[PDB]
């Protein structure tokens, strides 16, 4: 139709944005026509008129005829009761609340859902904020898409500056900035959600359960959209120090761990990147004050992670003495200060919190049984989520992985001596007291690196292109003599860094000799454990065997040269070892891993390989 209401206007507009995002430009002329009709909507993100007494007393005094804009309607004793109910639950003005209910009668959605008329008003109200805010994310997302025409990419850019951020275009030109409105906007969502649980829990302590669940889902989605919009706005260098201080204070006043903190994490990450790192407001003098300001907290792990990130990002200034001025300043004292601060942050559990957040972010309802118990053998002391149905999006995960990989690169290219001293400390601690379990800082860091580099071959290739870079340097340095946990973490990292065939072949060529880990030692340990079981076993040995089996299966499924070599290698004879191990007394996990390795090796085979496999199976089963 052409005369669509507010709800139908936003729903139709959303469909158009998806078309342009999915490589469908058949609605260019129709898209521009909608932004002009909803100009007043994009200006204010979310604002509910306060409940006024003039309309409350007037609505109930003469509930006979209602006049909204140009049209006229008649109020009856039944409809009038729904207006007061909707206005009370949401604390919305009677005039605005009535318009929402009128839209339901016209569209006639009461029969499509079979719910009370007053309840539909709550859903219709939440739908407006959903599309009104969700559509804004698509505009900025399409404005940053590099796989589209440069002309179209710029059209949505300037439009968002004026429609969303209220900044006029360059060819023209009391008002309030966007951030202060966004901060107050998100604040209303929190206060509205808090009062919702208090009132809902009171009456609960019905047919509206699903409606309350849908409203909570819409609220969390709107909060995520507002967080993404704030992140995008900050990415354009449109912030200041006051907003940063306010955000830091809000974080310090954080009470409970929930999805909102995970959504705000990237906001603080971008803040530190713009201010802390030398990729933004490059005011060296200003950075000194922020350092002392950051370096009250109701949760020490948050402050530890914040300080660690700030140090990692701000240690890039003190690399050379030619791109900036470093006169009349001592270096060793500041280096020792940053080192002790990072050590304290580690002891407080910064990497632990980062790993817990990364794990809770990608929480999947179902997981492949081929990777059970992987990366779940640590000591997690951080409380988990309440398990409520709040699934995450994809852009948020992408941004989180990008920020994590950036932090990893920064920490590897800025603080190598820190990692060296930490590894030496862990080694000497495990040596002087083997009965005790040393800290898992390095293992947690490697697991975080693995989580960051997952399904992103464009970034994983960086570890193979330049073998003389810092990335390859750390990769080859982390393969020397170490304990079982570090070897297992490195094997898991290698397995997760094989999303394609090229990376698998690169890892295969780098693992074998051309000291670092080699297939020779792996097979020697396999044969040793086989002879020991066949003439007990510790959890570390089983974990190492499972990691080796998973890595072999991944390499065989991804690479071809390894599959063709190991299958007929005379010096390895992996099949015999895995069979002698499976026929022994061991848990079912090792047998399952061996079976999956066999499957991977036999994913692509020929007549000779089939004959050999059948011969071995018959010989070992007869």
């Amino acid at each position: 139709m052409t005369d669509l209401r507010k709800l139908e206007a936003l729903q139709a507009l959303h469909a158009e944005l998806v078309a342009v995002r999915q490589h469908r430009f058949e609605g260019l002329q129709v898209l521009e026509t909608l932004l002009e009709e909803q100009t007043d909507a994009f200006k204010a993100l979310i604002a509910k008129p306060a409940r006024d007494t003039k309309d409350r007393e007037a609505l109930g005094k003469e509930p006979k005829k209602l006049k909204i804009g140009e049209e006229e309607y008649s109020l009856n004793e039944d409809f009038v009761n729904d207006c007061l109910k909707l206005a009370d639950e949401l604390d919305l003005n009677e005039k605005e609340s009535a318009r929402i209910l009128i839209d339901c009668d016209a569209e006639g959605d009461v029969e499509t859902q079979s719910r009370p008329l007053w309840e539909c008003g709550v859903i219709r109200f939440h739908q407006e904020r959903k599309y009104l805010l969700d559509c804004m994310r698509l505009i900025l997302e399409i404005a940053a898409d590099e796989d589209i025409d440069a002309g179209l990419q710029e059209s949505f850019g300037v439009a968002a500056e004026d429609k969303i951020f209220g900044i006029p275009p360059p060819w023209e030109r009391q008002v309030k900035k966007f951030i202060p409105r966004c901060m107050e906007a998100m604040k209303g969502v929190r206060s509205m959600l808090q009062c919702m649980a208090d009132k809902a829990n009171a009456r609960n302590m019905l047919d509206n359960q699903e409606t309350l669940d849908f409203s909570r889902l819409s609220l969390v989605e709107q909060h995520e959209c507002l967080a993404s919009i704030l992140h995008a706005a900050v990415q354009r260098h449109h912030a200041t120090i006051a907003d940063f201080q306010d955000f830091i204070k809000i974080l310090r006043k954080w009470d409970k761990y929930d999805h909102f903190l995970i959504h705000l994490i990237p906001v603080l990450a971008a803040y530190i990147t713009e201010f802390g790192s030398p990729e933004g407001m490059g005011d060296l003098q200003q950075a000194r004050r922020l350092n002392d300001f950051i370096c009250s907290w109701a949760l020490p792990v948050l402050g530890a992670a914040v300080r660690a990130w700030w140090i990692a990002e701000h240690n890039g200034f003190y690399l050379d003495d030619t791109v900036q001025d470093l006169r009349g300043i001592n270096l060793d004292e500041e280096d020792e200060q940053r080192t002790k601060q990072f050590l304290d942050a580690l002891k407080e559990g910064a990497f632990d919190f980062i790993l817990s957040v990364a794990a809770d972010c990608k929480a999947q309802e179902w997981q492949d049984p081929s990777q059970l118990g992987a990366r779940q053998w640590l000591q997690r002391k951080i409380p988990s989520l309440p398990s409520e149905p709040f699934p995450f999006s994809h852009f948020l995960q992408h941004s989180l992985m990008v920020h994590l990989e950036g932090f990893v690169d920064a920490t590897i290219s800025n603080l190598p001596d820190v990692l060296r001293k930490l590894r030496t400390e862990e080694d000497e601690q495990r040596q002087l007291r083997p009965n005790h379990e040393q800290d898992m800082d390095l293992e947690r860091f490697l697991i975080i690196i693995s989580y960051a580099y997952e399904g992103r071959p464009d970034a994983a290739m960086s570890f193979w292109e330049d073998p003389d870079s810092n990335l390859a340097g750390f990769l080859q340095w982390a393969s020397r003599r170490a304990s079982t946990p570090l070897v297992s973490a490195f094997c898991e990292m290698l397995r997760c860094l094989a999303d394609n065939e090229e990376c698998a072949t690169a890892a295969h060529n780098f693992l074998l000799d051309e000291q670092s880990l080699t297939w020779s030692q792996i097979f020697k340990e396999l044969e040793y454990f086989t002879t020991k079981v066949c003439s007990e076993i510790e959890p570390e040995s089983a974990l190492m065997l499972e990691c080796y089996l998973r890595l072999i299966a991944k390499l065989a499924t991804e690479s071809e040269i390894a599959r063709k070599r190991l299958i007929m290698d005379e010096d390895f004879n992996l099949v015999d070892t895995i069979l002698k191990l499976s026929v022994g007394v061991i848990p079912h996990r090792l047998r399952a891993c061996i079976f999956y390795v066999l499957k991977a090796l036999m994913i692509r085979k020929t007549h000779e390989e089939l004959d050999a496999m059948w011969r071995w199976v018959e010989a070992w089963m007869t």
């Binding site: 507010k6 206007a9 909608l34 009709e37 003039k54 007393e57 209602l66 909204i68 929402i100």
Partner: protein, 159 residues
């Protein structure tokens, strides 16, 4: 104010809409969900500028920009007692409101209105530049200026 909003007297609520308008309480009138006030305005919108402005506010906040551009344009072309500068504001608003999408209305219908408002706004600015200059001109007799102000400070004239 409870007793007021709890009433079902319709002539009363009409008299109160008029009274809110009089006192200037855009605060409380724009905050009424009801269509009853919209319908009341739709009958007297094309009767008075102040009422039309209220009607257009209700449309815009409901993303019905094209309908407001229609009310504003007709008001600028009308023979109501409206000053030229007020007719420049009406056209300028209609031009903006017709340039943005309004759901349920064809791109062709939007552009044709945005184009009519753009042309009439161009003529109106010319007329305003003339009237101002003529009134201020030292070489124009006072007797003529009053006559110029009568014929140019009103509906928009042909080129």
């Amino acid at each position: 104010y409870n007793v007021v909003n709890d009433s079902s007297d319709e002539v009363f609520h009409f008299d109160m809409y008029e009274w809110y308008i009089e006192k200037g309480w855009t605060d409380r009138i724009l905050s009424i969900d009801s269509p009853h006030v919209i319908t009341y305005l739709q009958r007297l919108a094309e009767t008075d500028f102040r009422h039309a402005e209220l009607l257009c506010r209700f449309y815009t906040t409901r993303s019905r920009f094209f309908e407001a551009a229609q009310v504003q344009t007709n008001l600028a072309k009308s023979d109501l007692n409206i000053s030229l500068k007020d007719r420049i504001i009406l056209l300028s608003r209609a031009k903006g409101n017709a340039s943005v999408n309004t759901i349920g209305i064809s791109r062709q219908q939007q552009q044709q209105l945005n184009h009519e408002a753009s042309e009439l706004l161009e003529i109106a600015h010319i007329q305003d530049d003339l009237l101002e200059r003529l009134v201020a001109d030292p070489r124009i007799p006072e007797e003529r200026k009053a006559e110029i102000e009568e014929f140019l400070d009103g509906p928009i004239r042909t080129l």
